Ligand binder design. Structure first.
Ligand code: XOM
Length: 285
């Protein structure tokens, strides 16, 4: 008599049979999270986390969102969090987009006729842009927290020279809020290893694809950028503002703020939480 294989486990040895999951096109398991409101959801919203991080970091945002009677759902991108795959490795950047579309396609079927929003930060924001541009007309609304549209020139050129000759980021540039930098540095699911070269060329590659997709955007969106962001240049968010065709487009600059605006100084963070709340609320009522 043949036997079933020993259960599939996350890279932290938890059986997938125990967690919300989905199998992707390459047969890799993805860890999933769901925040479901009491009663009928007004809409669906997918949260796309950034490079090195994981969906767990979006707990508070997602609870506010679910607060407005939306169904929030997320998964960890491949090579992130509790999803399978070599840490911060992807065959091609398009995998992230495809994997989102799959999760949305699934969720839409289970919840027919509901509008769907995207929320992304950083690389997760670049993924949201590409996701939207691949399906013009399909998403109700897009919320972008300092999305990767243009990469910091100082840093990009440094990396390009280093790559041309083939270290971990100073995590202080994340946030003026030093408690949040510390929380980041002590989260076991994060990948704080230096940026591999193959993944770094991929991100500069995504910058290029994002610029090509900009003119094709028609989806409504809210765009939150810090003026002193040393990872995703603020110039990128002006470009998005200029090139997108969306009839419904809005930009908040946070003067002096760094990169992770939902994890910044409370004045900033509270504003970020409020604007997202106001915007999504107006477009679901
Ligand atoms: C050389 C170079 C420099 C800068 C970028 C772009 O900056 C990246 C930072 N990236 C994220 O996605 C992470 C930031 C983080 C961590 O945890 C959070 O909450 N925020 C998510 C995008 C690309 C390249 Cl090639």
């Amino acid at each position: 008599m043949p036997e079933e294989s020993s259960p599939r486990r996350t890279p932290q040895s938890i059986p997938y049979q125990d967690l919300p999951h989905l199998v992707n096109a390459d047969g890799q398991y993805l860890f999933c999270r769901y925040w479901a409101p009491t009663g009928t959801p007004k809409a669906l919203i997918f949260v796309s986390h950034g490079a090195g991080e994981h969906s767990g970091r979006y707990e508070e945002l997602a609870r506010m969102l679910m607060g407005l009677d939306l169904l929030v759902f997320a998964h960890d991108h491949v090579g992130h969090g509790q999803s399978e795959g070599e840490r911060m490795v992807v065959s091609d950047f398009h995998v992230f987009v495809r994997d989102v579309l799959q999760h949305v396609d699934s969720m839409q079927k289970d919840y027919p006729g509901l509008p769907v929003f995207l929320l992304g930060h950083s690389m997760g924001g670049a993924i949201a842009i590409l996701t939207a541009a691949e399906r013009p007309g399909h998403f109700a609304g897009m919320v972008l927290i300092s999305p990767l549209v243009l990469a910091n020139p100082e840093s990009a050129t440094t990396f390009k020279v280093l790559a041309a000759k083939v270290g971990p980021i100073d995590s202080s540039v994340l946030s003026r809020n030093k408690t949040e930098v510390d929380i980041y540095n002590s989260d076991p699911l994060i990948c704080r290893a230096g940026l591999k070269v193959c993944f770094g060329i991929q991100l500069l590659n995504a910058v290029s694809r994002v610029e090509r997709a900009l003119p094709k955007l028609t989806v409504p969106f809210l765009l939150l950028q810090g003026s002193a962001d040393r990872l995703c240049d603020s110039k990128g968010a002006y470009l998005l503002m200029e090139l997108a065709k969306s009839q419904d487009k809005t930009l908040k600059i946070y003067e002096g703020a760094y990169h992770v605006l939902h994890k910044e100084l409370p004045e900033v963070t509270n504003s970020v939480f409020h604007e997202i709340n106001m915007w999504v609320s107006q477009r679901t009522a």
